[PDB]
């Protein structure tokens, strides 16, 4: 057989379309001011980022060591506005938009763009409408427990920073796309992943699902976790299948 | 209770001398034929003196500690009043609505203001007045 489509997604025509993107959305390099105090920035712009649901905020900070201003690109939280002051650091207040160590915020606070490691500059809860919940602190050997959008519980060090509030851009997925063309335009600014041909619509040379005098898979579509590339298609390492009626 | 009165320090907010600090000389609350609005006659600092330190020489300090003034009639709406006020020794009746009609009297009034402002700068009793506003 030939190299299946999933195996060809290794670069080339499958790279991300990034010309129209203004910059990665990052927290700010963890520095002396944030470790010990706070630093104030002003929201200069709130902008659309092609390929991203959530809007981005360009935030201007004074450089502590040089006569210069540093512009940061943040994931905008809902409620943020241009001209707003945001404060980042250990002593920042618990206000929507501020950036604080998760260990400095009480249990139950709603946060976004949370670091997995202290200083990684934001990993968790970044897509539109998403957030992370503080679940508890363990002061001895400081580790904070958080709930992720997937429902998983994670332990981050109580120095990983987070942004107070929910990512802006609301309930985007509530609107039916309604048309192939709208899906076309959504993925045109993302990557070459649409439209998708079904495996069973192919010939055996193309896909493990291909071939047959009717369109059918043949063997089970739940394939083992340790399948080789080229046979790892369908429902990979599925714990179960079918329409769930009540889950947790 | 009248914010704008002679001797008060105000900030110009519009025009060529925007951001320059001025001292009110006359407060014409009612409008005249020329300037039919609540205007004021003011004297302000067009070029603030430069800071001087102990390491400077005598001649250099003399150069830096100079004031170039201006005199102007300004609408009240182009003034931001402050809380400071100046003493206004001999700038009492020297700048009326008649020195503006003559450039000769204008230069004479400015020279008089320059002497009092400069002498007032030395031995600083109103330091805030001669420091530029940064904006």
């Amino acid at each position: 057989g030939r190299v299946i489509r999933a195996q060809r997604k290794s670069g080339g025509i499958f790279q991300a379309h990034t010309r129209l993107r203004k910059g990665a959305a990052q927290l700010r390099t963890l520095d002396f001011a944030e470790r010990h105090g706070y630093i104030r920035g002003v929201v200069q712009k709130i902008i659309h980022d092609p390929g991203r649901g959530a809007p981005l905020a360009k935030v201007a900070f004074r450089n502590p060591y040089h006569y210069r201003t540093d512009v940061e690109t943040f994931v905008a939280t809902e409620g943020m506005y241009t001209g707003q002051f945001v404060y980042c650091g250990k002593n920042a207040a618990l206000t929507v938009g501020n950036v604080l160590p998760v260990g400095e915020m009480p249990e139950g606070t709603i946060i976004s763009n949370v670091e997995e490691k202290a200083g990684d500059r934001g990993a968790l809860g970044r897509s539109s409408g998403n957030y992370v919940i503080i679940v508890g602190h363990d002061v001895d050997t400081g580790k904070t427990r958080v709930k992720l959008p997937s429902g998983a519980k994670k332990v981050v060090p109580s120095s990983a920073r987070g942004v107070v509030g929910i990512v802006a851009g609301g309930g985007r997925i509530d609107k039916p796309l309604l048309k192939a063309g709208r899906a076309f335009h959504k993925y045109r600014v993302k990557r070459n992943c649409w439209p998708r041909t079904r495996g069973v619509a192919m010939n055996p040379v193309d896909h493990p699902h291909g071939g047959g005098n009717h369109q059918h898979v043949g063997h089970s579509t739940t394939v083992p976790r340790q399948s080789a590339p080229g046979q790892k298609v369908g429902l990979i390492a599925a714990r179960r299948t079918g329409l769930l009626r009540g889950a947790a | 209770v009248k914010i704008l009165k002679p001797g008060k320090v105000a900030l110009i907010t519009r025009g060529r001398f925007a951001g320059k600090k001025v001292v009110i000389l006359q407060a014409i609350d009612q409008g005249s034929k020329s300037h039919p609005f609540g205007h004021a006659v003011v004297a302000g600092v067009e070029r603030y003196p430069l800071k001087v330190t102990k390491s400077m020489g005598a001649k250099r300090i003399a150069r830096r500690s100079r004031v170039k003034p201006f005199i102007k009639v300004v609408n009240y709406n182009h003034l931001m009043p402050t809380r400071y006020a100046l003493e206004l020794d001999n700038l009492k009746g020297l700048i009326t609505a008649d020195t503006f009609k003559e450039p000769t009297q204008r230069s004479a009034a400015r020279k008089t203001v320059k002497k009092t402002f400069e002498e007032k700068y030395q031995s600083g009793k109103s330091a805030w007045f001669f420091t530029p506003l940064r904006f």
Binding site: F32, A33, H36, G37, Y38, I39, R40, R62, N63, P64, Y65, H66, Y67, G89 | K51, V52, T53, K54, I61, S65, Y121, Q122, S123, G124, A127
Partner: peptide, 29 residues
């Protein structure tokens, strides 16, 4: 003489640009 006025700089977090201190300990050699 009266024009020579002290102009202190605070140097706390977020106040004045830090003075040029010795960074030898943190130099990438």
């Amino acid at each position: 003489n009266p024009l020579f006025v002290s102009r202190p700089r605070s140097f706390g977090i977020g106040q004045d640009i830090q003075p040029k201190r010795d960074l030898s300990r943190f130099v990438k050699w």
